[PDB]
Design a protein around this ligand. Structure first.
Ligand code: HEM
Length: 181
């Protein structure tokens, strides 16, 4: 299935690339790094978890920004290859004001953009070189490059004219993106 994008009308005139840069600047970096994960404040969480589920979500420690990844996800924690997120991601949703987690599915109250039918898939054995790992860990760490590259490849696979340098409105014109009510 080809990529499909939903977006808040607010961002219609933004390029996908520019939106991702800005969102990442707003989320910042949760400092999910050696020596810097010392409590539960920058781990994020799995649904149902603790180390697997159909969602991973994390809140910014710098702002209200948050994201949710939907799919079939597994985190190795200390087990070799350590600190690898692997499995499949179908959807990534970016925005503000995370809700749920506790019997409810994670969801953003302000879902700004959502990218679905991503068909990302990574095996455990790929370790931290897996596309799933790099995409999500990038977002955690203030670098939306990996996500941008993946969306870019999925748009181009539809047609070489479509890319992250298109606006959301451009992609809606091309039938690939859709404004949220
Ligand atoms: C429940 C969720 C998670 C928990 C409890 C968790 C726990 C940890 C802890 C405790 C560390 C630090 C280890 C140390 O300082 O010795 C760590 C590091 C790390 N975690 Fe996570 N983590 C979670 C989710 C994620 C996710 C979703 C990713 C990737 C998308 C990830 C990637 C990493 C990476 C790359 C490191 C750095 C390891 C290194 O450079 O050696 N973690 N994690």
């Amino acid at each position: 299935m080809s990529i499909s994008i939903s977006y808040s009308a607010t961002y219609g005139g933004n390029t996908v690339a520019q939106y991702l840069t800005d969102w990442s600047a707003y989320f910042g970096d949760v400092n999910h790094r050696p020596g810097e994960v010392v409590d539960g404040t920058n781990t994020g969480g799995f649904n149902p978890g603790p180390f697997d589920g159909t969602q991973y979500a994390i809140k910014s420690t710098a702002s209200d920004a948050a994201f949710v990844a939907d799919g079939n996800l597994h985190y190795t924690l200390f087990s070799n290859p350590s600190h690898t997120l692997w499995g499949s991601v179908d959807t990534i949703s970016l925005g503000d004001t995370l809700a749920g987690g506790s019997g409810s599915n994670y969801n953003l109250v302000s879902q700004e953009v959502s990218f679905t039918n991503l068909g990302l898939n990574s095996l455990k054995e790929e370790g931290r070189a897996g596309e799933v790992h790099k995409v999500v860990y990038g977002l955690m760490s203030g670098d939306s490059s990996a996500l941008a590259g993946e969306i870019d490849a999925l748009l181009k696979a539809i047609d070489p004219s479509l890319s992250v340098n298109s606006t959301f409105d451009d992609l809606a014109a091309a039938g690939v993106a859709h404004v949220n009510p």
